[PDB]
Amino acid sequence: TCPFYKKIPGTGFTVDAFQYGVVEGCTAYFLTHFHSDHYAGLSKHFTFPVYCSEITGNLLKNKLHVQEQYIHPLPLDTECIVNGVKVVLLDANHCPGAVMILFYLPNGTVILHTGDFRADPSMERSLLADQKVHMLYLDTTYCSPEYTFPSQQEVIRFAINTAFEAVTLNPHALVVCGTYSIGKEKVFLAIADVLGSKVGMSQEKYKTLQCLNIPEINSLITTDMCSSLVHLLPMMQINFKGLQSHLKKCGGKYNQILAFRPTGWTHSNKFTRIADVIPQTKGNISIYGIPYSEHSSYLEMKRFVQWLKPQKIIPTVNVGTWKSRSTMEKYFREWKLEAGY
Ligand code: NI
């Protein structure tokens, strides 16, 4: 059944709750972003109101064929009334179109639902600074101190410098980047920019990217593989067998692959700096796992929460095991005693 951490008390609302059938007493279904664990259940047969960003609404219409009459896109950073309740959508610094949702309940309670987010100090100057938040529905994906990772900027600098060096040493090298969802577009777009190439991809992935309102996108991507030396493939294909196979397909245009797997966290982060990352190599194929995250590190999460000073925290991730739940509640208490709220 629908878990309690997907329901907004004092409203008829749910968040990211499309796989439970008709939720009893739900008058408006919000969707924070277009990732499959969150939209699971949506289709052209859905007939309840869906509230979301403009970008998420483009993907619902074009990818899932949700009918236009049930898509209610809202502008960001704008007070809006939904079924009698004031709400605001805020940028979540996750994937394109991802939002956090502020609910102003009739009784005076204010609730923030982060959806999935990568906490950032810039959020401390949004509409969140203007009033007290009582309850926080928090993306706790990486809520443990072992999870450190570099800035997105450091990671993109590494990728750009690696790719440009490799292709300038060997102009017959192909660059390949893995993907299995929206998000992390900076990785492949920054590499293609430095190389003076468009990114080549399947018709399905090109359609997905054309829903994202990215400026000048027609100048950066293409379905013509042959004209491109940065290719995007399913993340599943980013292994030696899959890559050897792909290289056969390019008909001797290329004699080397350099491939990127933008993972979340990996335990090489506990030891190794970004400067010191090395690839796995077999023959003329090299694969780099780069720690490009669209979720908060432990320290970024902690800073956001100690700034916001909520009265109650409800985790939305890692909630399935008692040991995970108890660990997270211990960190919450540490943060509160350290900061004095
Ligand atoms: Ni997500």
PDB file of all heavy atoms in Angstrom, residues 295-314, unseen atoms left out:
ATOM      1  N   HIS A 295      22.960  13.607  -6.243  1.00  0.00           N
ATOM      2  CA  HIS A 295      22.448  13.573  -4.872  1.00  0.00           C
ATOM      3  C   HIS A 295      23.434  14.248  -3.923  1.00  0.00           C
ATOM      4  O   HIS A 295      24.663  14.182  -4.142  1.00  0.00           O
ATOM      5  CB  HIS A 295      22.134  12.108  -4.333  1.00  0.00           C
ATOM      6  CG  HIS A 295      21.100  11.371  -5.104  1.00  0.00           C
ATOM      7  ND1 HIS A 295      19.742  11.463  -4.839  1.00  0.00           N
ATOM      8  CD2 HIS A 295      21.223  10.427  -6.088  1.00  0.00           C
ATOM      9  CE1 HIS A 295      19.073  10.622  -5.615  1.00  0.00           C
ATOM     10  NE2 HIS A 295      19.950  10.023  -6.396  1.00  0.00           N
ATOM     11  N   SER A 296      22.914  14.761  -2.814  1.00  0.00           N
ATOM     12  CA  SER A 296      23.773  15.388  -1.776  1.00  0.00           C
ATOM     13  C   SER A 296      24.851  14.421  -1.264  1.00  0.00           C
ATOM     14  O   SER A 296      24.526  13.274  -0.964  1.00  0.00           O
ATOM     15  CB  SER A 296      22.916  15.759  -0.555  1.00  0.00           C
ATOM     16  OG  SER A 296      21.716  16.491  -0.912  1.00  0.00           O
ATOM     17  N   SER A 297      26.069  14.893  -1.096  1.00  0.00           N
ATOM     18  CA  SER A 297      26.987  14.174  -0.187  1.00  0.00           C
ATOM     19  C   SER A 297      26.456  14.304   1.265  1.00  0.00           C
ATOM     20  O   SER A 297      25.563  15.087   1.621  1.00  0.00           O
ATOM     21  CB  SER A 297      28.390  14.811  -0.310  1.00  0.00           C
ATOM     22  OG  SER A 297      28.437  16.093   0.384  1.00  0.00           O
ATOM     23  N   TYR A 298      27.083  13.499   2.136  1.00  0.00           N
ATOM     24  CA  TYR A 298      26.760  13.595   3.572  1.00  0.00           C
ATOM     25  C   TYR A 298      26.916  15.034   4.123  1.00  0.00           C
ATOM     26  O   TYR A 298      25.998  15.567   4.764  1.00  0.00           O
ATOM     27  CB  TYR A 298      27.560  12.556   4.425  1.00  0.00           C
ATOM     28  CG  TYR A 298      27.396  12.741   5.950  1.00  0.00           C
ATOM     29  CD1 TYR A 298      26.344  12.157   6.631  1.00  0.00           C
ATOM     30  CD2 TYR A 298      28.302  13.513   6.660  1.00  0.00           C
ATOM     31  CE1 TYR A 298      26.207  12.249   8.036  1.00  0.00           C
ATOM     32  CE2 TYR A 298      28.126  13.678   8.036  1.00  0.00           C
ATOM     33  CZ  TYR A 298      27.084  13.030   8.685  1.00  0.00           C
ATOM     34  OH  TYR A 298      26.895  13.166  10.061  1.00  0.00           O
ATOM     35  N   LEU A 299      28.087  15.627   3.833  1.00  0.00           N
ATOM     36  CA  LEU A 299      28.339  16.978   4.339  1.00  0.00           C
ATOM     37  C   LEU A 299      27.406  18.069   3.776  1.00  0.00           C
ATOM     38  O   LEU A 299      26.954  18.952   4.476  1.00  0.00           O
ATOM     39  CB  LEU A 299      29.827  17.379   4.120  1.00  0.00           C
ATOM     40  CG  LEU A 299      30.853  16.601   4.949  1.00  0.00           C
ATOM     41  CD1 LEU A 299      32.251  16.933   4.430  1.00  0.00           C
ATOM     42  CD2 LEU A 299      30.665  16.945   6.422  1.00  0.00           C
ATOM     43  N   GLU A 300      27.043  17.928   2.480  1.00  0.00           N
ATOM     44  CA  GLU A 300      26.102  18.890   1.825  1.00  0.00           C
ATOM     45  C   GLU A 300      24.689  18.777   2.440  1.00  0.00           C
ATOM     46  O   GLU A 300      23.987  19.771   2.726  1.00  0.00           O
ATOM     47  CB  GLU A 300      26.070  18.633   0.293  1.00  0.00           C
ATOM     48  CG  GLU A 300      27.361  18.950  -0.439  1.00  0.00           C
ATOM     49  CD  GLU A 300      27.475  18.400  -1.815  1.00  0.00           C
ATOM     50  OE1 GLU A 300      26.682  17.501  -2.248  1.00  0.00           O
ATOM     51  OE2 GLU A 300      28.492  18.720  -2.508  1.00  0.00           O
ATOM     52  N   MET A 301      24.251  17.516   2.653  1.00  0.00           N
ATOM     53  CA  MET A 301      22.952  17.237   3.336  1.00  0.00           C
ATOM     54  C   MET A 301      22.911  17.831   4.761  1.00  0.00           C
ATOM     55  O   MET A 301      21.958  18.502   5.150  1.00  0.00           O
ATOM     56  CB  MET A 301      22.734  15.704   3.349  1.00  0.00           C
ATOM     57  CG  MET A 301      21.391  15.260   3.730  1.00  0.00           C
ATOM     58  SD  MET A 301      21.256  13.435   4.012  1.00  0.00           S
ATOM     59  CE  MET A 301      21.680  12.850   2.347  1.00  0.00           C
ATOM     60  N   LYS A 302      23.993  17.548   5.502  1.00  0.00           N
ATOM     61  CA  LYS A 302      24.094  18.040   6.884  1.00  0.00           C
ATOM     62  C   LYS A 302      24.047  19.582   6.938  1.00  0.00           C
ATOM     63  O   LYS A 302      23.327  20.116   7.763  1.00  0.00           O
ATOM     64  CB  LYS A 302      25.425  17.531   7.482  1.00  0.00           C
ATOM     65  CG  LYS A 302      25.715  18.026   8.926  1.00  0.00           C
ATOM     66  CD  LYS A 302      26.945  17.401   9.484  1.00  0.00           C
ATOM     67  CE  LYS A 302      27.213  17.770  10.939  1.00  0.00           C
ATOM     68  NZ  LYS A 302      27.881  19.083  10.969  1.00  0.00           N
ATOM     69  N   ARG A 303      24.783  20.243   6.064  1.00  0.00           N
ATOM     70  CA  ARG A 303      24.762  21.719   6.063  1.00  0.00           C
ATOM     71  C   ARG A 303      23.353  22.283   5.807  1.00  0.00           C
ATOM     72  O   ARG A 303      22.847  23.161   6.489  1.00  0.00           O
ATOM     73  CB  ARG A 303      25.752  22.273   5.057  1.00  0.00           C
ATOM     74  CG  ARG A 303      25.645  23.807   4.955  1.00  0.00           C
ATOM     75  CD  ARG A 303      26.501  24.319   3.847  1.00  0.00           C
ATOM     76  NE  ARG A 303      26.194  25.748   3.619  1.00  0.00           N
ATOM     77  CZ  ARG A 303      27.040  26.737   3.891  1.00  0.00           C
ATOM     78  NH1 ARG A 303      28.266  26.489   4.392  1.00  0.00           N
ATOM     79  NH2 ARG A 303      26.654  27.979   3.683  1.00  0.00           N
ATOM     80  N   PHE A 304      22.663  21.723   4.766  1.00  0.00           N
ATOM     81  CA  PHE A 304      21.305  22.147   4.422  1.00  0.00           C
ATOM     82  C   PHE A 304      20.355  21.984   5.583  1.00  0.00           C
ATOM     83  O   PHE A 304      19.584  22.903   5.918  1.00  0.00           O
ATOM     84  CB  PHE A 304      20.810  21.351   3.183  1.00  0.00           C
ATOM     85  CG  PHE A 304      19.423  21.670   2.782  1.00  0.00           C
ATOM     86  CD1 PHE A 304      19.141  22.837   2.051  1.00  0.00           C
ATOM     87  CD2 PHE A 304      18.354  20.852   3.114  1.00  0.00           C
ATOM     88  CE1 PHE A 304      17.845  23.150   1.662  1.00  0.00           C
ATOM     89  CE2 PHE A 304      17.023  21.199   2.760  1.00  0.00           C
ATOM     90  CZ  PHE A 304      16.789  22.361   2.061  1.00  0.00           C
ATOM     91  N   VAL A 305      20.360  20.808   6.207  1.00  0.00           N
ATOM     92  CA  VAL A 305      19.479  20.552   7.321  1.00  0.00           C
ATOM     93  C   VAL A 305      19.806  21.468   8.547  1.00  0.00           C
ATOM     94  O   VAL A 305      18.808  21.937   9.206  1.00  0.00           O
ATOM     95  CB  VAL A 305      19.466  19.061   7.691  1.00  0.00           C
ATOM     96  CG1 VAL A 305      18.569  18.794   8.932  1.00  0.00           C
ATOM     97  CG2 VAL A 305      18.959  18.229   6.503  1.00  0.00           C
ATOM     98  N   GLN A 306      21.103  21.641   8.851  1.00  0.00           N
ATOM     99  CA  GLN A 306      21.453  22.481  10.053  1.00  0.00           C
ATOM    100  C   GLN A 306      21.099  23.963   9.743  1.00  0.00           C
ATOM    101  O   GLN A 306      20.860  24.734  10.656  1.00  0.00           O
ATOM    102  CB  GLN A 306      22.941  22.361  10.418  1.00  0.00           C
ATOM    103  CG  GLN A 306      23.212  20.992  11.032  1.00  0.00           C
ATOM    104  CD  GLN A 306      24.640  20.781  11.449  1.00  0.00           C
ATOM    105  OE1 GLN A 306      25.560  21.031  10.715  1.00  0.00           O
ATOM    106  NE2 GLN A 306      24.825  20.307  12.696  1.00  0.00           N
ATOM    107  N   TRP A 307      21.104  24.378   8.469  1.00  0.00           N
ATOM    108  CA  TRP A 307      20.623  25.735   8.074  1.00  0.00           C
ATOM    109  C   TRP A 307      19.106  25.816   8.250  1.00  0.00           C
ATOM    110  O   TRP A 307      18.554  26.843   8.814  1.00  0.00           O
ATOM    111  CB  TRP A 307      21.034  26.061   6.645  1.00  0.00           C
ATOM    112  CG  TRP A 307      20.414  27.341   6.158  1.00  0.00           C
ATOM    113  CD1 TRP A 307      20.833  28.617   6.512  1.00  0.00           C
ATOM    114  CD2 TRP A 307      19.248  27.508   5.365  1.00  0.00           C
ATOM    115  NE1 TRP A 307      20.024  29.558   5.921  1.00  0.00           N
ATOM    116  CE2 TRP A 307      19.013  28.935   5.240  1.00  0.00           C
ATOM    117  CE3 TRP A 307      18.390  26.640   4.714  1.00  0.00           C
ATOM    118  CZ2 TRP A 307      17.963  29.468   4.473  1.00  0.00           C
ATOM    119  CZ3 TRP A 307      17.319  27.188   3.923  1.00  0.00           C
ATOM    120  CH2 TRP A 307      17.109  28.578   3.856  1.00  0.00           C
ATOM    121  N   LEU A 308      18.342  24.843   7.733  1.00  0.00           N
ATOM    122  CA  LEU A 308      16.925  24.891   7.722  1.00  0.00           C
ATOM    123  C   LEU A 308      16.266  24.721   9.089  1.00  0.00           C
ATOM    124  O   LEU A 308      15.194  25.333   9.359  1.00  0.00           O
ATOM    125  CB  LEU A 308      16.332  23.804   6.744  1.00  0.00           C
ATOM    126  CG  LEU A 308      14.890  23.848   6.386  1.00  0.00           C
ATOM    127  CD1 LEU A 308      14.629  24.997   5.420  1.00  0.00           C
ATOM    128  CD2 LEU A 308      14.461  22.584   5.654  1.00  0.00           C
ATOM    129  N   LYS A 309      16.880  23.927   9.956  1.00  0.00           N
ATOM    130  CA  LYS A 309      16.376  23.717  11.328  1.00  0.00           C
ATOM    131  C   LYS A 309      14.929  23.215  11.438  1.00  0.00           C
ATOM    132  O   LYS A 309      14.049  23.724  12.176  1.00  0.00           O
ATOM    133  CB  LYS A 309      16.658  24.951  12.229  1.00  0.00           C
ATOM    134  CG  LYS A 309      18.098  25.334  12.262  1.00  0.00           C
ATOM    135  CD  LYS A 309      18.324  26.617  13.095  1.00  0.00           C
ATOM    136  CE  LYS A 309      19.789  26.900  13.302  1.00  0.00           C
ATOM    137  NZ  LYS A 309      20.573  27.230  12.093  1.00  0.00           N
ATOM    138  N   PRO A 310      14.609  22.156  10.671  1.00  0.00           N
ATOM    139  CA  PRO A 310      13.253  21.622  10.753  1.00  0.00           C
ATOM    140  C   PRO A 310      12.924  21.026  12.137  1.00  0.00           C
ATOM    141  O   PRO A 310      13.807  20.535  12.810  1.00  0.00           O
ATOM    142  CB  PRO A 310      13.270  20.522   9.650  1.00  0.00           C
ATOM    143  CG  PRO A 310      14.664  19.991   9.747  1.00  0.00           C
ATOM    144  CD  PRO A 310      15.529  21.245   9.927  1.00  0.00           C
ATOM    145  N   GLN A 311      11.637  20.987  12.476  1.00  0.00           N
ATOM    146  CA  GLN A 311      11.179  20.376  13.725  1.00  0.00           C
ATOM    147  C   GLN A 311      11.063  18.891  13.647  1.00  0.00           C
ATOM    148  O   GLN A 311      11.232  18.182  14.639  1.00  0.00           O
ATOM    149  CB  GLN A 311       9.812  20.963  14.173  1.00  0.00           C
ATOM    150  CG  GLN A 311       9.939  22.443  14.572  1.00  0.00           C
ATOM    151  CD  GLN A 311       8.586  23.098  14.919  1.00  0.00           C
ATOM    152  OE1 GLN A 311       7.540  22.467  14.852  1.00  0.00           O
ATOM    153  NE2 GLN A 311       8.625  24.366  15.281  1.00  0.00           N
ATOM    154  N   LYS A 312      10.824  18.369  12.443  1.00  0.00           N
ATOM    155  CA  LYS A 312      10.668  16.923  12.230  1.00  0.00           C
ATOM    156  C   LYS A 312      11.221  16.581  10.805  1.00  0.00           C
ATOM    157  O   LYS A 312      10.909  17.280   9.829  1.00  0.00           O
ATOM    158  CB  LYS A 312       9.215  16.423  12.344  1.00  0.00           C
ATOM    159  CG  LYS A 312       9.090  14.903  12.262  1.00  0.00           C
ATOM    160  CD  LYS A 312       7.659  14.374  12.427  1.00  0.00           C
ATOM    161  N   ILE A 313      11.993  15.475  10.739  1.00  0.00           N
ATOM    162  CA  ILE A 313      12.567  14.935   9.465  1.00  0.00           C
ATOM    163  C   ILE A 313      11.918  13.567   9.177  1.00  0.00           C
ATOM    164  O   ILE A 313      11.932  12.662  10.058  1.00  0.00           O
ATOM    165  CB  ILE A 313      14.095  14.873   9.495  1.00  0.00           C
ATOM    166  CG1 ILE A 313      14.697  16.239   9.777  1.00  0.00           C
ATOM    167  CG2 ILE A 313      14.623  14.343   8.167  1.00  0.00           C
ATOM    168  CD1 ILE A 313      16.175  16.230   9.951  1.00  0.00           C
ATOM    169  N   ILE A 314      11.459  13.358   7.923  1.00  0.00           N
ATOM    170  CA  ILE A 314      10.895  12.101   7.416  1.00  0.00           C
ATOM    171  C   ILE A 314      11.764  11.665   6.229  1.00  0.00           C
ATOM    172  O   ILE A 314      11.724  12.273   5.162  1.00  0.00           O
ATOM    173  CB  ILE A 314       9.433  12.271   6.968  1.00  0.00           C
ATOM    174  CG1 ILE A 314       8.559  12.813   8.129  1.00  0.00           C
ATOM    175  CG2 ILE A 314       8.903  11.000   6.333  1.00  0.00           C
ATOM    176  CD1 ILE A 314       7.138  13.070   7.756  1.00  0.00           C
TER     177      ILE A 314
END
